[PDB]
Amino acid sequence: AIKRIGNHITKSEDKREYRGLELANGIKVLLISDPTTDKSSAALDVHIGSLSDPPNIAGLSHFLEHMLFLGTKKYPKENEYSQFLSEHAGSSNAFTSGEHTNYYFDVSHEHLEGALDRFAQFFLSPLFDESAKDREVNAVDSEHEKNVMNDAWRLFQLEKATGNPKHPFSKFGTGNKYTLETRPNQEGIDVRQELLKFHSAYYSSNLMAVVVLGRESLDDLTNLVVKLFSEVENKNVPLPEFPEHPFQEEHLKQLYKIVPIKDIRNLYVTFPIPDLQKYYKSNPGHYLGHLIGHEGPGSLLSELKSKGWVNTLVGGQKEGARGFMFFIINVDLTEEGLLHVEDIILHMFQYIQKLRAEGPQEWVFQELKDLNAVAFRFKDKERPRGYTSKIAGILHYYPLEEVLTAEYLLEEFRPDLIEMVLDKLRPENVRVAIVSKSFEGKTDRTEEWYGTQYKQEAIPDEVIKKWQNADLNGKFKLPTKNEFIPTNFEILPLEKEATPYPALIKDTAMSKLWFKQDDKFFLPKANLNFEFFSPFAYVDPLHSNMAYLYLELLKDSLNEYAYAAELAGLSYDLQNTIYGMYLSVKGYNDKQPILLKKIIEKMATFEIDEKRFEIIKEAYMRSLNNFRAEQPHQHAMYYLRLLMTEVAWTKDELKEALDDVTLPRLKAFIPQLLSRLHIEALLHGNITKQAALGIMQMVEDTLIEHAHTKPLLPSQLVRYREVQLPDRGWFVYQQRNEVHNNSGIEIYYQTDMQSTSENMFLELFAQIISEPAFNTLRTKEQLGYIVFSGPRRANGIQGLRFIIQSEKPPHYLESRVEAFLITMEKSIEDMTEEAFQKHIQALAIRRLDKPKKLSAESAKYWGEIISQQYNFDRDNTEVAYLKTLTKEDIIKFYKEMLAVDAPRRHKVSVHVLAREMSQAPALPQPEVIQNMTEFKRGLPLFPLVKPH
Amino acid sequence: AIKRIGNHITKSPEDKREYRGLELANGIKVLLISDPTTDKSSAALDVHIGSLSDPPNIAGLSHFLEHMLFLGTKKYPKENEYSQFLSEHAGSSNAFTSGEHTNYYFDVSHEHLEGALDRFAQFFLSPLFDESAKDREVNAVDSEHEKNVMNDAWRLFQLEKATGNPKHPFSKFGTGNKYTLETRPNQEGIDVRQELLKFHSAYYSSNLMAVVVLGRESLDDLTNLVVKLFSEVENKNVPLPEFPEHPFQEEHLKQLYKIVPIKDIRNLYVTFPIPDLQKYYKSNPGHYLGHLIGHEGPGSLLSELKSKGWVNTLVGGQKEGARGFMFFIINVDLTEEGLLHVEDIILHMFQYIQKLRAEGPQEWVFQELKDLNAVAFRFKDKERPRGYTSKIAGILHYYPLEEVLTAEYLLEEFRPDLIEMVLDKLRPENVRVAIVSKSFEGKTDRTEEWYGTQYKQEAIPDEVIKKWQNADLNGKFKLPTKNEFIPTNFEILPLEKEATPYPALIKDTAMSKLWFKQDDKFFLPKANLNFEFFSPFAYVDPLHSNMAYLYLELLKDSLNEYAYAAELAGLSYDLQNTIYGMYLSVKGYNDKQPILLKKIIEKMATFEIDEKRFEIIKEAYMRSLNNFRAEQPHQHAMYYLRLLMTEVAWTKDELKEALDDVTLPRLKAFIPQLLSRLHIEALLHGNITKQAALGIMQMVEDTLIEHAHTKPLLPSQLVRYREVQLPDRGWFVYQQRNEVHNNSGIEIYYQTDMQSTSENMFLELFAQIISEPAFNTLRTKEQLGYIVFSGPRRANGIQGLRFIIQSEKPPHYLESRVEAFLITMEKSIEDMTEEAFQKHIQALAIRRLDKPKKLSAESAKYWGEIISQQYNFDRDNTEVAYLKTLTKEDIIKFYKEMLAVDAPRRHKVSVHVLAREPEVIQNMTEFKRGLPLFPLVKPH
Secondary structure (H helix, E strand, O other), X not given: OOXXXXXXXXXXXXXXXEEEEEEOOXXXXXXXXXXXXXXXXXXXXXXXXXXXXXOOOXXXXXXXXXXXXXXXOOOOOOOHHHHHHHHOOOOOEEEEOOOOEEEEEEEEHHHHHHHHHHHHOOOOOOOOOHHHHHHHHHHHHHHHHHOOOOHHHHHHHHHHHOOOOOOHHHOOOOOOHHHHHHXXXXXXXXXXXXXXXXXXXXXXXXXXXXXXXXOOOOHHHHHHHHHHOOOOOOOOOOOOOOOXXXXXXXXXXXXXXXXXXXXXXXXXXXXXXXXXXXXXXXXXXXXXXXXXXXXXXXXXXXXXXXXXXXXXXXXXXXOXXXXXXXXXXXXXXXXHHHHOHHHHHHHHHHHHHHHHHHOOOOHHHHHHHHHHHHHHHOOOOOOOOOHHHHHHHHHHHOOOOOOXXXXXXXXXXXHXXXXXHHHHOOOOOOEEEEEOOOOOOOOOEEOOOOOOEEOOOEOOHHHHHHHHHOOOXXXXXXXXXXXXXXXXXXXXXXXXXXXXXXXXXXXXXXXXXXXXXXXXXXXXXXXXXXXXEOHHXXXXXXXXXXXXXXXXXXHHHOHHXXXXXXXXXXXXXXXXXXXXXXXXXXXXXXXXXHHHHHHHHHHHOOOOOHHHHHHHHHHHHXXXXXXXXXXXXXXXXXXXXXXXXXXXXXXXXXXXXXXXXXXXXXXXXXXXXXXXXXXXXXXXEOOOHHHHHHHHXXXXXXXXXXXXXXXXXXXXXXXXXXXXXXXXXXXXXXEEOOOOOOEEEXXXXXXEEOOHHHHHHHHHHHHHOOHHHHHHHHHHOOOOOXXXXXXXXXXXXXXXXXXXXXXXXXXXXXHHHHHHHHHHHHHHHHOOHHHHHHHXXXXXXXXXXXXXXXXXXXXXXXXXXXXXOOOOOHHHHHHHHHOOOOOXXXXXXXXXXXXXXXXXXXXXXXXXXXXXXXXXXXXXXXXXXXOHHXXXXXXXXXXXXXXX | OOOOXXXXXXXXXXXXXXXXXXXXXOOEEEEEEEOOOOOOEEEEEEEXXXXXXXXXXXXXXXXXXXXXXXXXXXXXXXXXXXXXXXHHOOOOEEEEEOOOOEEEEEEEOOOOHHHHHHOOOHHHHOOOOXXXXXXXXXXXXXXXXXXXXXXXXXXHHHHHHHOOOOOOHHHOOOOXXXXXXXXXXXXXXXXXXXXXXXXXXXXXXXXXXXOEEEEOOOOOHHHHHHHHHOOOOOOOOOOOOOOOOOOOOOOOOOEOOEEOOOOOOOEEEEEEEEOOOOOOOOOOHHHHHHHHHOOOOOOOHHHHHHHOOOOOOEEEEEEEOOOOOEEEEEEEXXXXXXXXXXXXXXXXXXXXXXXXXXXXXXXXXXXXXXXXXXXXXHOOOOOOHHHHHHHHHHHXXXXXXXXXXXXXXXXXXXXXXXXXXHHHHOOOOOOEEEEEOOOOOOOOOEEOOOOOOEEOOOEOOHHHHHHHHOOOXXXXXXXXXXXXXXXXXXXXXXXXXXXXXXXXXXXXXOOOEEEEEEOOOOOOOOEEEEEEEEOHHHOOOHHHHHHHHHXXXXXXXXXXXXXXXXXXXXXXXXXXXXXXXXXXXXXXXXXXXXXXXXXXXXXHHOOOOOHHHHHHHHHHHHHHHHHHHHOOHHHHHHHHHHHHOOOOOOOHHHHHHHHHHOOHHHHXXXXXXXXXXXXXXXXXXXXXXXXHHHHHHHHHHHHHHHHHOOEOOOOXXXXXXXXXXXXXXXXXXXXXXXXXXXXXXXEEEEOOOEOOHHHHHHHHHHHHHOOHHHHHHHHHHHOOOOEEEEEEOOXXXXXXXXXXXXXXXXXXXXXXXXXXXXXXXXXXXXXOOHHHHHHHHHHHHHHHOOOOOOHHHHHHHHHHHHOOOOOOOOHHHHHHHHHOOOOHHHHHHHHHHHHOOOOOOOOEEEEEEEOOOOEOOOOHHHHHHOOOEOOOOOOO
């Protein structure tokens, strides 16, 4: 079905040459041309979701997009695609939505044609084998199992199900093993014949959106892929749409009271509204979302803060199905924010009434049009994975010149649209849902799949009538015009000082200043990552708590000014570390010094409100013991970083230490912390040397002006060490989770500090153990959905870790982990030298890649300056060293460090029990670990790194 | 001349040594000491003779005779034969010369009574006085006067002796120099010897001898052993030279002195001459005055003098003189501005005297001091075998043989009329003033005769006199309150089922930890308590460390005035700091340590700061800090060694610079932060019970919680500091330049290992095998220096070997010859026989092995084990049981891998100290960056 149409595309700063076309069998085609990109890519998206499933089997398309991986007629072997993208550094993945399932992958250079050959003919011949089926049912059951107690998916499906039960919206989306194979076989239904029915009828027809990120040309990739795509055959499946919202007045004006697992409190407001997807030029939803969820002077959130009932909120237009859509408002609750909800809804309707009074505005439309004009014009670059899938996601709705100016450019103002959407948002149409823990013994109607409990009580007409008649204005105002808007678009010419790496241009006992100028990207932006260092941060539980609440109330105060800048494209973040305080400004080159001056001057002389401190205190006290509820792989990684640092306060002691946090204690603490400190900063981007010197001087002078900061002495620039293992030990201990009925494990291996050799030894071993572990443990042995192999580097020491979540006894799992190590040990000799080359080159191109976004190279340089390495050219160093490796070297790595007959064995695992609870070699008895401090008592400590 | 008069002597029952006093017919006072348990014997001779007896033209003749009288008897006319007999048998002799005594004493190894007595009796028969004794003892006198040139005691005493009546024998010189002995006599041709035989025959032989024998034989053998060889002393009936008049005969009253010193010292000297109260030993008013003047308590004189900030300390009381007269002295400290307010000071002493003249004498005070000194005599502890004999031979002359033990430690009666008499004696007509100050340059013409210091008469004028007498009133001065408490309980407590020989852990909580041991061996009414307060904030940064320092220092300065009167009752304490926390010691009796410890905790909980006190402590520590440029460079080397090989260490430079910011509000904020949350640890040892020990600790920590709401620490923050691991090959060094001393120190450190049970005894035996031959070869033969030391190092649970040598040398020459000494000892290893081996390991054994002798010893050793968190209570016995199972090759193999020059395990590191004129170490922080850290020790 070879038909071709293309022309000039309005593509903004970008250099990627473009064309688009569409094949006569209903296939959208995008041609991307770029001669400077390493990794080429492509990504197919089928415009069919899981709301188009058959009425008997739930999560059938979910299981199909899993099952479309394995097996074609041209290459019927199982992992062939995946192994071919493990050979040439590719990484495919897929996800599922209500109406879309979207395949995507990556490749290096010319290897795209080989990758596409496996990828394209999945559609002709899918196989659906014994083992594929019988293992994917376990992978789907684990996919549902991690989402059982996750409160986001819980409330998602509970909203999905309490609508129209006649609408397909009510039907389940993922499906556990019970609906996938237990439900059909007790009905006699063959799984495979539905898969073939579904692939033939729905999938094969239309509505594909392919893209091709290629580095060849335009014309040659064109006449490659047009020839290569004529085998997809049109079937004329009509566009599946829904002509009505799921709330046909049986389910309107209704409340719900939901009991969560984690102690959270949230309030959910929903409006069903007709579709404005045809109105993507004017897009009233951006105007409504801009005005409602704004955070400025006279905003609604400012009022909710001023009464202290709501911490933060977000609202706006929520996307839904093709036919209908939603409009949400989601706020946080405090104690009497939980008790005085009705007044919160009254204030939302008063702000809506303020919008009902003034109506639409035009200077807002001009302001947002200029902001999206600039912001779309100066876009940096794109990820070769994810960009192509995103554009192919939005290619469905737009003509061939609007594929790029998709929604990031808006032409016209249609205020009649704003009166209509204003007329929908009324108290007749509101749905309310309260999430609170205290609703125990009171909720009878149980969820069918997950098991949460809720109750609907029709709102008493008195509250409804009071909502409609009482719509007036109190103290809510329209948001003042922004001033955080740039006029700085002038590219600064690089100086005679043409260094390619940031140099230490200023050294004191107070600070350290590193500086470059952007030779490549030529954008008017710069980065600033000041990092504060202080002794008193981690001295005790008490002072660490004081640090977290200090920086928390700091951001809570300086948020209300900061919101307009962050909305304008000037972002910041104050955070705390074990070392000190962390500052990161990023954005345009307009008001860099102005915002930075204000932030630093504000956090210099800072004050505390009483009930504000009480709310932040209570809330973080509740957030501490919430750390019981996470997945046990995270819980295990938390215990690993507990044992492998020098000092570490656990969450129990940190929780208990808030028993003494009084407000005068904080107000005494603050200037003692701020008294003396050290600053080390990375400055990167479109500025000059002298302006960088002025910004740094500015900073330290502001500090000396406020709190009279004096420099530190260089003997308390300490870092934390990491615990030595006794050269032969295999250590382990266990915890027990309360909520989840699953066990986790993490299997640590201490090699050595980062010397130039050890990095490339461990990287090559890591890549040769990456893909076969996914092939045999999760896929072939079906150990668990969460499998994570690879290298962990902490405190300047290299390590190897394996993360396995399943529902098993963990010692069986240890035994089969070691069995996988023996299997790899034998497979090492089997690997050919040519296969080794198809691995060391993938390590070179995996390691070597030039940054695309400026934030990437700045984050990399920063990530190396905070580690005191400063070796900015380790990439060239490591790659040049990397070519001088052999295979017998990796046995010399395997034997003494990793094997079981190892004299230098440095092994340690962590068990995490569940709520309730082919061969293995001779593993010795383990030790029990009662006191983690008494563990670390007699053990040596590692050195730190020699600075380059 | 065998005459005997004695009987049973009353001794407080704890003592068991049996005594007998008698006196021989030739005028010899005899006491008999029988202790069959003493290792070393000694002997003593007391002559009641004075420099006043020596002829008016030549001073100190008897001093030069009693020097020259040592060598040569008729039974042993050889020169050194006495001295050689005491050099063989470990003996050591030493005598002094006073205004009314010359008192010979000596000792001997075990049994040499007969021997030494053959070398001791014919001093009375035959003194020789030959050419050589004369010509050597004149050099001995010249060296005694030359070293007593700069001795300030003798200088001020002679200046008090000589500025009275210049005819009175009080103005004589006690020792006598070379001028009177051989400069004026030989130019006048006068024979010293004939005057020496005159003096010896007429004066010494007559009477009033005080022979005494520290023996271990029996009560009689030594008795008729010395009475046999003491009959050649023949009575002469020389009358007792006494003075019936004071030497300050109104010519020198109401007088000042202005003294020019060599050393930068400052002192103020008030002197009162007073009559004889020696017959009145019943009340002893002179020590009563020393009690009431030098008291430091509520309403005391020095209490207000401190409150005015002029005077650190004082001392006063009765000063003995000749038989006839006695003295009464007051010795006070001076500040800078104390030199301007002299008359004010003297007015305050008079004011005090007047307060005592107003409310008068006291009787219950005398009874209290009587009961406390009754207890202090009842429960004596011990006595040194040397020095004791010369003392008790000193008072044998003045007291009957029954009063020789209840000597002054008992007071019969109260004499308020006498106290009125001496209260009438402390008046400004009587005062004698002397002032010490360096600032008296060009102003004092009147030079001292012997030493050559310069002074001034400078009588106090009369307006200053008259203001003292008629204008006399009281301010803030009050007599002291009674502190009887309870002294009635001295009963011993019987041992219970808990018969441990080592302290048992009777309580463990997360707040404290309590170890306990009732006294089995001593059965003495004494108790010891030790306390550690652990807290993280001590050594976090130089500012916090300074705040902790100043806190405990000024805490002591606050509590001293209240506590000192309790310290007079027999309960001593000490507060100091650690790098970890604070150190509290409470030592004394069992009766009232609970009330004292209660008030100590109640006091240091609620604590305040004074301004000028804070300023004085601040300035004082600023001096103590910037002094550290000026100490001995071997100490400099030990300080830098403890800097480099610990985890964190703040040098004195940062502590010096950071003190600019220590203000009062900052400390007053810091104190409750420190005291908020902490850990306790305690050793309890003495005659006590388990329940009262548990109850006192409970009560104590409850009071601690009562004040500042004490909460326990978290058991993950009881960390300790580790020690730096050398890289298995390193020989590291760097240098430090002294500023003041033109001398170069050096310390040669060697890392072996952690304390395993073998390594302690490896290092002790190897240390001892290089101990005595290093003493033989280094200073004598190699002539390295005078301050040379070697041996172990115990720090952070890690052993070590070191060589501290300070000299004025190039430091690398000294390292090279130190390595030559290691090679010399290395080959000196392989030539060792069995005999040297066995005496050496037995030497180590008896060096280590000893039973204890007092509760402070065992309590200090057990505390020394709990502070290191080792807890190995019987390492003594285990290490000794291990020690005999070693060979020569065990220490050869111990030596080679760690210590040799071609060693794989050679852990060597040095510190160079230069005079004012491997790898290098640029930054000590960048040094400690990349070296690993050792583990700690598992507690048993």
